[PDB]
Amino acid sequence: SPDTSVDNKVNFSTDVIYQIVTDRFADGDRTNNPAGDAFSGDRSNLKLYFGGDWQGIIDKINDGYLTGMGVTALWISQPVENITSVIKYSGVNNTSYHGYWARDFKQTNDAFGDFADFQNLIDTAHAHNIKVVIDFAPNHTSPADRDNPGFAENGALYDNGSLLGAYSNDTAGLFHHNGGTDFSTIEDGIYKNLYDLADINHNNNAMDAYFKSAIDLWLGMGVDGIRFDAVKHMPFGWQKSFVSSIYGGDHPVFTFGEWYLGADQTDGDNIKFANESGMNLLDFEYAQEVREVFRDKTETMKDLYEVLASTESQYDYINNMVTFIDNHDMDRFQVAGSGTRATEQALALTLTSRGVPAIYYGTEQYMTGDGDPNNRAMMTSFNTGTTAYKVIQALAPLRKSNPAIAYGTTTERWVNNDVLIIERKFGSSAALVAINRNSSAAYPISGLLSSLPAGTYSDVLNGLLNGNSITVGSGGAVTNFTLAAGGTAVWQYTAPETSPAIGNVGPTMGQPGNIVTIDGRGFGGTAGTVYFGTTAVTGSGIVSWEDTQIKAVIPKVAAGKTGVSVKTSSGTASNTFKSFNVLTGDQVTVRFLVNQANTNYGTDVYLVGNAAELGSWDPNKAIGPMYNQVIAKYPSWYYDVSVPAGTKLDFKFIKKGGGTVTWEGGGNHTYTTPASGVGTVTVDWQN
Ligand SMILES: [Ca+2]
Ligand SMILES: [Ca+2]
Ligand SMILES: [Ca+2]
Ligand SMILES: [Ca+2]
């Protein structure tokens, strides 16, 4: 099957995701509706269950509402069994309608449906060439008070109905007992509770095995992708080990996490997580800037382009960014009393930009509402006639048919404070997008250049947003035209590639023997070579080959980041996909601890070692800076690190800072890592 097939679970940049809060979308089965104080019949209390369920999603696929839009993936509320108790929070009864208060990750939330309902949703979606993404929240269970067991359900955790433990009587050490976080540092937000949510201890072997087992069940039923909740509040090392076990399992899938960023904020740890964790990220820098430019008018088109360029240079895998313009935690894009063209233009930009676009349910019906839970009202209408519906219908399928939009580079061709003209290019295909946010003034466009070959191009939107046709001359020169007030147009050209061209490689990280997927154009029908760096993969090591997709087995090659490329059976080479990170083997998570390592202000302890996962003795690739506040206290330091299973590691600790790099004295430390799960090592500093 080709790169655009619904069967391609690891690469999503040809898709458009529709994000559904399950309880708030469509009640297709009133018999699974919660009863009593847990249900809001008149929808007065938006913290209660309203009744939306998987059957309702199934109905809106079959009757064509969701298919009519060109949407090709559905991202749904965490499917797992939640607590069924109603919690009073400052006078207001609250429920698990949102799906984030888990108690059994191996059972369904019966409000949404049973396991047969879930398999039907998967089946109806795939049958319509729609992928299914689930929220997954392994950070915590549910609200709990350690010193008052009676509150809620004490954050209890069941395994197929059998109680592994609760917060108040936690003899196995399943949870952290370190208080609640004040969000003051990243370390503080990982190893402590988020509000009153019982924080899982993933340095526990039973917890590592539990979540690996639980995710495999959902992936076994055909789930195509995972939205990891709260990735800022779990150890980076555990998450890298966790997604490496997915990529090495039977069901490699696209994964991405939520790492919130505020407006005008960039964060080095966010960047490092997106580039090194093996998991991708929701693109908050893009989302906040688009909101500023179109919704709030607190930035201009020039500022928007600057963010497009700075995200491109800082993120290694820009086609994996999941872009959006709002979600279930922000104010709705549509502001009561504003017009709808801001929504329309923001969608048009997002649907044609690099990455993986995601649309929050009801965006296309101009739903309004500020803050949680007002931004989670019941879907107001299924009107397929709104301009926004038709904008998505027109432009989402371009991601499947034009490889410039799914894979291509991004180049500004014209920019002032109100107008942005952007070109996407991939080999012989290209797309040109023009947007004028000024609602009372048209702008003449003169001397615009493009990569479009000569001829006359009609607007893909056909004037729905006051766009126009253009005439392109010899050198990609675009004949003078006027971009109308509020105007938005898309012009495109797609041509069959003749040279092999890689658009994406998924997953982005893997140990030898994993199956990776290479998507692009012009690979030929018959098998050729795949080049992990300088080493060739042919014959047995190619699982399947065709013109837009190759599946291949990672070869036993030096661990570390490397380029991936293909040569056709006619000996023709491709471009190289940058920074594929080969692992040494399967991963475990080890907590490394070092004592009596004192430092002055501005100097941090780091971990170096022999395996690539430990930097290969490069203090430039050292792991850290380590932590010293919560799990263990300065002058003790600790860090949770993804390292190869069953492996004799040699390592030392170092002290680096503004210039100086101090090394550990004596001989090396040595440790054989576990064959599965998680581990720990405690060492003394050596002067
Ligand atoms: Ca229902
Ligand atoms: Ca249909
Ligand atoms: Ca945590
Ligand atoms: Ca600003």
DSSP string across 438-470 = -SS--EEE-S-B-SPPSEEE--TTTTTTS---E
Question: Does 372 count as an annotated binding residue?
Answer: yes
* Contacts of residue 98, Cβ cutoff 8 Å, sequence gap at least 6: 21, 23, 77, 328, 376
Q: By C-alpha distance, which of 613, 632, 514, 638 is closest to 560?
A: 613
Give the number of whichever ligand sits closest to the CA of residue 304. 4
Cβ atoms of residues 606 and 600 within 8 Å: no
63 C-alpha to center of ligand 2: Å? 6
Residue found by looking up tokens 């399992």 in the block: 249
Q: Judging by DSSP bridges, how do beta strands 542-545 and 535-537 pair with one another?
A: unpaired
Question: What residues are neighbours of ligand 2 (ion), with CB under 5 Å?
Answer: 64, 67
Instruction: Fill in the amino acid letter for 161.
Output: G
Q: What is the assigned CATH class of domain 497-583? A: mainly beta
**Half-sphere exposure in the Cβ direction for 216 (13 Å, CA):** 14
Cβ atoms of residues 55 and 398 within 8 Å: no
Catalytic position from the list 135, 208, 258, 344 = 258
343 C-alpha to center of ligand 4: Å? 19
Question: Matching CATH topology for 497-583 and 584-686?
Answer: yes
Phi, psi dihedral angles at 385 (to 5 degrees): -100, -5
137 C-alpha to center of ligand 3: Å? 10
Give the number of whichever ligand sits closest to the CA of residue 97. 1
359 C-alpha to center of ligand 3: Å? 28
Which residues in 284-303 are b (16+ Cβ under 10 Å) and which e? bbbbbbbbbbbbeeebbbee
Distance CA 626, CA 187 (A): 10
Cβ atoms of residues 678 and 208 within 8 Å: yes
3-state secondary structure of 37: helix
585 C-alpha to center of ligand 2: Å? 44
Q: How big is the chain, counted in residues?
A: 687
Question: Does 126 count as an annotated binding residue?
Answer: no
Give the number of whichever ligand sits closest to the CA of residue 265. 4
Question: Does 480 count as an annotated binding residue?
Answer: no
Cβ atoms of residues 35 and 95 within 8 Å: no
What does DSSP assign to residue 38? G
Return the CATH architecture of domain 1-401. Answer: Alpha-Beta Barrel (3.20)
Question: Does 547 count as an annotated binding residue?
Answer: no
3-state secondary structure of 227: strand
Q: Is residue 296 flagged as an active site residue?
A: no
68 C-alpha to center of ligand 2: Å? 7
Cβ atoms of residues 432 and 490 within 8 Å: yes
* Rounded alpha-carbon distances, angstroms, from residue 191 to 102, 268, 349, 428, 587: 19, 20, 39, 50, 21
Residue found by looking up tokens 């039973």 in the block: 206
Question: Does 395 count as an annotated binding residue?
Answer: no
Cβ atoms of residues 327 and 19 within 8 Å: yes
Give the number of whichever ligand sits closest to the CA of residue 288. 4
- The whole-angstrom distance between residue 18's C-alpha and the CA centroid of its chain comes to 14
Question: Does 199 count as an annotated binding residue?
Answer: yes
64 C-alpha to center of ligand 2: Å? 4
Q: Where are the domains of the chain?
A: 1-401, 402-496, 497-583, 584-686
Tokens (6 digits) for 423:
């070109």
Question: Does 33 count as an annotated binding residue?
Answer: yes
Give the number of whichever ligand sits closest to the CA of residue 176. 3
Strand partners, 470: 457
> Residue 314 is inside which H or E element, if any?
helix 301-314
* Contacts of residue 166, Cβ cutoff 8 Å, sequence gap at least 6: 144, 149, 153, 154, 155, 156, 157
Catalytic position from the list 15, 104, 208, 229 = 229
Question: Does 663 count as an annotated binding residue?
Answer: no
Distance CA 199, CA 632 (A): 17
Report resolution in angstroms.
2.1
* Rounded alpha-carbon distances, angstroms, from residue 474 to 108, 339, 455, 479: 60, 39, 9, 10
Cβ atoms of residues 323 and 357 within 8 Å: yes
Q: Judging by DSSP bridges, how do beta strands 560-567 and 577-582 pair with one another?
A: antiparallel
Phi, psi dihedral angles at 295 (to 5 degrees): -85, -45
302 C-alpha to center of ligand 2: Å? 41
Cβ atoms of residues 130 and 73 within 8 Å: yes
Q: Is residue 114 flagged as an active site residue?
A: no
24 C-alpha to center of ligand 1: Å? 10
Name the CATH superfamily, with its identifier, for domain 402-496.
Golgi alpha-mannosidase II (2.60.40.1180)
* Rounded alpha-carbon distances, angstroms, from residue 559 to 112, 437, 585, 611, 643: 43, 48, 9, 8, 12
What does DSSP assign to residue 613? G
Distance CA 291, CA 432 (A): 22
Return the CA Rg of the chain: 26
CA torsion sign for 203, 222, 324, 509 is positive
Question: Does 174 count as an annotated binding residue?
Answer: no
Question: What residues are neighbours of ligand 4 (ion), with CB under 5 Å?
Answer: 264, 298
Q: By C-alpha distance, which of 143, 53, 132 is closest to 96?
A: 143
- Experimental technique, in short, is X-ray
Cβ atoms of residues 157 and 163 within 8 Å: yes
| Residue 257 burial by Cβ neighbours in a 10 Å radius (0-12, 13-18, 19+) | buried
Distance CA 574, CA 497 (A): 12
Cα angle, residue 296 at apex, residues 291 and 299 outer, rounded to 5° = 75
Distance CA 603, CA 628 (A): 12
Instruction: Report the topology of domain 584-686.
Output: Immunoglobulin-like (2.60.40)
